[PDB]
Structure 1
Amino acid sequence: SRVCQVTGKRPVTGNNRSHALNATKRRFLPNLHSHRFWVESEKRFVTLRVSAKGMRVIDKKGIDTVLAELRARGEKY
């Protein structure tokens, strides 16, 4: 589903509030993108469905760390 593999972000539900304050249900979706991350530790490419915030987290932390916690969470990449 539309779940960021790294950050765990998933769609939420809010309202479209018009100018006249009419409220209709809507969904906020994360900005996911299927990206091919390169890992030095294996000499290999790892493809993850990760939002832009998740890619920023990847740059900040490191690909090895994020896979470490992905495996700890048990999700298969």
Structure 2
Amino acid sequence: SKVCQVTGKRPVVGNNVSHANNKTKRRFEPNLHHHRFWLESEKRFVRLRLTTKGMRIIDKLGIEKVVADLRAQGQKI
């Protein structure tokens, strides 16, 4: 499913609103994609499915911290 491993973002629902104010169901999707990160402490590449906000959090906190946090929630990475 389209779920980010770092933030938990997922598609949401909303409306298309026309100029005549007709309303139609739509979805908003995350900016999801796969990326490989070098885990030094284990000497290996780890593949994650995440958003660009997830990348910003990784740049802010470091990859090993995020990996430990994810393993703390029972994720197999």
TM class by shorter-chain length? over 0.9
TM (norm. structure 2) is 0.94
Do residues 15 (structure 1) and 18 (structure 2) align? Answer: no
Do residues 34 (structure 1) and 34 (structure 2) align? Answer: yes
Listed as ranges, the gaps of 5+ residues in structure 1 are: none
CA distance in 2, matches of 1:26, 1:63: 34
RMSD between superposed Cα atoms in Å: 0.8
Percent identity over paired residues = 73
| Paired amino acid for 2:63 | I
| Paired amino acid for 1:62 | G
CA distance in 2, matches of 1:33, 1:48: 8
CA deviation after TM superposition for structure 1 residue 43, in Å: 1.1
| Paired amino acid for 1:66 | V
Pairs aligned (count): 77
Runs (4+) of structure 1 exceeding 3 A deviation are none
1:61 aligns with 61
